[PDB]
Amino acid sequence: NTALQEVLKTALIHDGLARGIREAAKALDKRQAHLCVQASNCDEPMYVKLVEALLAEHQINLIKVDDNKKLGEWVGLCKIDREGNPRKVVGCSCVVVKDYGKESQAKDVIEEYFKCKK
RNA sequence: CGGACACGGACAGGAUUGACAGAUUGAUAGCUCUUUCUCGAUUCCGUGGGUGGUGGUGCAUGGCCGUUCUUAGUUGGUGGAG
Ligand SMILES: [Zn+2]
């Protein structure tokens, strides 16, 4: 009840992610990948095929979330605003975390990992 | 581009930087082209708006300077004359 709601929010303040239309499916080629997250709304079944092509045989875990636009208020391009339009992003389908930087509430997402995925 | 900002568009399922080789050039200017890797919201597109200019106008001006002007010249106050 803590995993899906707020402990992924606390890993998004100024952490490393993907951003824009040229590096979303990029960070799997690097040896700095912590917890990543992929949408269960992807219009092609080859993009999600491409991200599981690496991580399923390696040390990297995807979280299946609802869509990518709802990750748009997660990535950092702030469109929820007082005098601004609350629909400006078409958000990311695959962001990663290079590094946590702080250790407030990061145990709970990795506790989700080795609880069932072993 | 060294066109700031403001709005909209473009916009993670593909906005934008940079670049080896070669016809390509005056030029090892990725200038353009063929091919293809790379850069991480930085931008790019449109519209308003700045901005820059050894661009005009010295008869729109300021400031400085030259000149009649190297000669002795100039002016109020108060009385007097009109
Ligand atoms: Zn002119």
Report what the structure shows.
The chain is mainly alpha-helical. About 20% of the residues lie in helices and about 5% in strands. The chain contains three helices and three strands. The protein has helices at about 45-55, 70-75, 105-115; strands at about 35-40, 65, 95. The protein has a three-stranded mixed sheet with strand order 2-1-3, with no helix packed on it. Helix 1 (about 45-55) links the parallel strand 1 (about 35-40) and strand 2. It is globular, with a radius of gyration of 14 Å. The two termini are about 20 Å apart. The chain binds one RNA strand of 82 nucleotides through strand 3. Keywords: Acetylation, Cytoplasm, Nucleus, Ribonucleoprotein, Ribosomal protein. It is found in: Cytoplasm; Nucleus, Nucleolus. This is Small ribosomal subunit protein eS12. One of its GO terms (molecular function) is structural constituent of ribosome. It holds the Pfam family Ribosomal_L7Ae.
